[PDB]
């Protein structure tokens, strides 16, 4: 009746244990799934049009401090002043500026120049950098239409176009300067469905934005996300205002943690990254750049002053970040600090770092400061540093910093295992995970911190090359097509795999109206073809008709090469010969190879017929419908 | 020597069912816990305060 309940309950609640253990694992992953980055784009002063430029510059100890620009119409004559307290003047005349801010391609998005001059430059930079970042991911932007990808960004108002305007520009100034438009505008270009959010949290704005996206990504509200920052100064008044506080270095260079720190330095920049769930990224096979592990955001609250920070708040947010990531301080190795270079801020941050990380370190951890090369990039600043870390992780190298003469004396440098990067050091893989940390502290008091980890090891696969391959390229304009051809040739001058290049071209690119194709079998052949390209056809197609001829097309050795080339055609011709076998008296394969007299109608006509049938099959194989 | 397992298995497994069902309820509430409103203030035209 119920005597054999033993085995029954055994199997029953063994299954119960399995199911609900799986449930527990699911809840742990949903509350703490790591995130993955699959593409970055950056634009910084000094001609940094790619992460490679930034990595090269930091590896070569290159500064980017320049003089005030003049294109923006600023009246620098009445602003530069050795006198420090004269009204409406600045005692500095240097900084890291993005001198290429004005230029923009409105035609690519089909926008009339009226809006182009109307809209703020920051929106244009956001659009272009977003397109660049999406391209870097190897994802077709067109295919994103109708998808549910969200978007978050951080920016602050600049008063661009605050003066009186011509009556022609009516109907564009509002949306041109409307903040909430910007992110949404991007969606309008790409037709996305995810939420569009713009935030304002001073310098930390970018990092906070990223954190926000993470939460949404964990809640199943989107499949993938884009986040970044941008900052372009319309007027230099801030300089003058900061001249009042005397907090600006007359040299215009931030000497972070150096004993000769005397101020700060402003700068501009744009940066965008793409985030996705780790499991989904592995499922899609997207190449993983880095893994984002933990984030934390808090508020300074009551302190010494309105803008005076407190070390304890920074310690609290650091502990919260570590707890969320579930990692001990001993597990991290390198930190990119705020590195403002101010007299007062640096000691507090350093003491907080000593109190937090400087406890029981097996090895002296290292800290860096990107601002010493570029200055304070404000809203974008944060995300910029992240990219730097990623490159340092990819090259297995630890870049050094600049303007280091003597560590500040306010810090007991023997209180913990803390050392600076005066020189580059190798950071090889060892079998144990490598981790890095970033922090940011806004003037308003809000603070954020991030902890990221190296990507999982990947297994390369060797693929044989091919005899010959085609190379395609598409663009919206002929000149853009020429520029793309030039860039592709320049890259092809190096050492790459032709098959890999062809596959990437046919897989990780969109299709446009301006098109060009070159068939190559060697790298030098490819270079010659690319440099020799001269024409492109933007012709509207009509209707396709497959014309069939009569006679006279034949010649010696008809079906010899392509038989060995394309197996599908070989199968088709074999099937045709088998079907016509009940009436032949010769080897059709031989005669098409050229082993029979083709001057006989009873031979040539079936042979030509089979040739045409096979060619029609081949043309079908490439998806051509007559 | 193994006749002492059936009852132990039964007890273990009642405990497991109970606790992990409670855990599942916890995760459901974490996903969708309702929120309560406790304070409210406003300022609108028409003299409303």
């Amino acid at each position, epitope marked *: *009746m*119920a005597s*054999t*309940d033993s*085995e*029954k309950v055994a*199997e*029953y609640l063994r*299954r119960a244990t399995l*199911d609900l253990r799986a449930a527990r694992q699911r809840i742990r992953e949903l509350e703490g799934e790591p995130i993955a980055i699959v593409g970055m784009a950056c634009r910084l002063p000094g001609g940094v049009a790619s992460p490679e430029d930034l990595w090269r510059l930091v590896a070569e100890r290159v500064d980017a401090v320049s003089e005030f620009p003049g294109d923006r119409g600023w009246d620098l004559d009445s602003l530069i002043d050795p006198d420090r307290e004269r009204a409406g003047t600045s005692y500095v005349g240097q900084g890291g500026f993005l001198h290429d801010a004005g230029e923009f391609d409105a035609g690519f998005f089909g926008i009339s120049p009226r809006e182009a001059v109307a809209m703020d430059p920051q929106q244009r930079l956001l659009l272009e950098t977003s397109w660049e970042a999406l391209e870097n991911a190897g994802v077709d932007p067109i295919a994103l239409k109708g998808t549910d990808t969200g978007v978050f960004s951080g920016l602050m108002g600049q008063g661009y176009g605050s003066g009186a305007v011509a009556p022609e520009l009516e109907g564009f100034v509002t949306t041109g300067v409307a903040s909430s438009v910007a992110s949404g505008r991007v969606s309008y270009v790409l037709g996305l469905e995810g939420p569009a959010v713009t935030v304002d949290t001073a310098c930390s704005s970018s990092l906070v934005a990223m954190h926000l996206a993470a939460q949404a990504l964990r809640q199943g509200e989107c499949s993938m996300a884009l986040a970044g920052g941008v900052t372009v100064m319309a007027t230099p008044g801030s300089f003058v205002e900061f001249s009042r506080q005397r907090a600006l270095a007359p040299d215009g260079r931030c000497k972070a943690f150096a004993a000769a720190a005397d101020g700060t330095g402003w700068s501009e920049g744009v940066g965008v990254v793409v985030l996705e769930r780790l499991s989904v990224a592995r499922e899609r096979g997207h190449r993983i750049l880095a893994v984002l592990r933990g984030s934390a955001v808090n508020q300074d609250g009551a302190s010494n002053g309105l803008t005076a920070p407190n070390g304890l708040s920074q310690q609290r947010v650091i502990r919260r970040a570590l707890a969320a990531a579930g990692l001990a301080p001993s597990d991290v190795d390198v930190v990119e600090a705020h590195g403002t270079g101010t007299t007062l801020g640096d000691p507090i941050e350093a003491q907080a770092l000593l109190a937090t990380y400087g406890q029981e370190r097996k090895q002296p951890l290292w800290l860096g400061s990107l601002k010493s090369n570029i200055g304070h990039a404000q809203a974008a600043a944060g995300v910029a540093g992240v990219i730097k870390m990623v490159q340092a992780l990819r090259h297995e190298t630890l870049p050094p910093t600049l303007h280091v003469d003597k560590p500040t004396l306010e810090v007991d440098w023997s209180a913990g295992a803390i050392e600076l990067l005066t020189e580059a050091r190798a950071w090889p893989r060892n079998g144990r995970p490598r981790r890095a940390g970033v922090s940011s502290f806004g003037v308003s008091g809000t603070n954020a911190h991030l902890i990221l980890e190296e990507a999982p090891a990947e297994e390369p696969v060797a693929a044989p090359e091919l005899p010959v391959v085609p190379l395609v390229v598409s663009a919206r304009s002929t000149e853009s097509l020429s520029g793309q051809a030039e860039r592709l040739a320049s890259l092809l001058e190096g050492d790459v795999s032709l098959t890999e290049v062809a596959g990437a071209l046919v897989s990780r690119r969109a299709v446009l109206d301006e098109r060009a194709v070159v068939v190559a079998g060697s790298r030098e052949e490819a270079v010659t073809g690319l440099r020799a390209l001269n024409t492109a056809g933007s012709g509207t197609p009509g209707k396709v008709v497959w014309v069939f001829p009569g006679q006279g097309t034949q010649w010696a050795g008809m079906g010899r090469e392509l038989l060995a080339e394309s197996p599908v055609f070989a199968e088709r011709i074999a099937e045709c010969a088998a079907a016509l076998a009940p009436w032949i008296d010769w080897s059709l394969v031989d005669v098409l190879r050229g082993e029979g007299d083709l001057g006989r109608v009873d031979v040539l006509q079936p042979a030509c017929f089979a040739v045409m049938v096979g060619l029609a099959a081949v043309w079908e194989s490439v998806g051509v419908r007559p | 020597m193994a006749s002492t397992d059936s009852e132990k298995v039964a007890e273990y497994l009642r405990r497991a069912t109970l606790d992990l069902r409670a855990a599942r309820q916890r995760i459901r509430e974490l996903e969708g816990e309702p929120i309560a409103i406790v304070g409210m203030a406003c300022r609108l035209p028409g003299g409303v305060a």
Partner: antibody, heavy 118, light 114 residues
């Protein structure tokens, strides 16, 4: 993950023999006890047989309807079950399934159609 | 002596609605351990059978959370908060205390209301 592969089906004359192989993967096969259940087309579900596990000795039990004609065997080393048709009849034509768990049929295979006709 | 169970034969349903299916037994499946022995299985049209419910209350993994069950003694009930289109097919409430279980019975066919 747990996955089942069923093979050995087809069309068979009356009164012949056949072998059905079920292969299990993605878990530890040695613990569970397996079962076989068929379904005639346009009908319900009827139990056929089952085999225990070596923990309890791995005895076998069969339905009296096909008693002595179909046999169940298991291979723990290869973790594959074998079910043998003997003295087949047309009415036995059905789609068959093998399931993990003697009492709980939690996991099911892709099924296998077997038709008996002359 | 051989226990048996009965459920409503068929019930048209409307997508997005709650639904409830009763299953009443010829005896109390409750055992000295403190458990009833009844499970609920579902077969979709032209697909392998799938397990839904076991020990009356607790729900197996993979099953959507919209399903639930309750009852005791000789009476039990499966409930679904939200009816969806793909949930058409046949369901079986089958005992497990009495062995050897032989046949699944006629079950219950579900269909779209119109």
């Amino acid at each position: 993950e747990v996955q089942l592969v069923q093979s050995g089906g087809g069309l068979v004359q009356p009164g012949r023999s056949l072998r059905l192989s079920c292969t299990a993967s993605g878990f530890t096969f040695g613990d569970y006890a397996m079962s076989w259940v068929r379904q005639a087309p346009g009908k319900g579900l009827e139990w056929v047989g089952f085999i225990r596990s070596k923990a309890y000795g791995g005895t076998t039990e069969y339905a009296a309807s096909v008693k002595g004609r179909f046999t169940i065997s298991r291979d723990d080393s290869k973790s594959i079950a074998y079910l043998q048709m003997n003295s087949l009849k047309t009415e036995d034509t059905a789609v068959y399934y093998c399931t993990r768990g003697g009492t709980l049929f939690d996991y099911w295979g892709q099924g296998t159609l077997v038709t008996v006709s002359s | 002596d051989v226990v048996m169970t009965q459920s409503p034969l068929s019930l048209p349903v409307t997508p997005g609605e709650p639904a409830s299916i009763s299953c009443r037994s010829s005896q109390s499946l409750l055992h000295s351990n403190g458990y009833n022995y009844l499970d609920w299985y579902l077969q979709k049209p032209g697909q392998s059978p799938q397990l839904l419910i076991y020990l009356g209350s607790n729900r197996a993994s993979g099953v959507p959370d919209r399903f639930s069950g309750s009852g005791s003694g000789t009476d039990f009930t499966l409930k679904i908060s939200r009816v969806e289109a793909e949930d058409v097919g046949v369901y079986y409430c089958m005992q497990s205390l009495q062995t050897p279980r032989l046949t699944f019975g006629p079950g219950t066919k579900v269909d779209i209301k119109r």
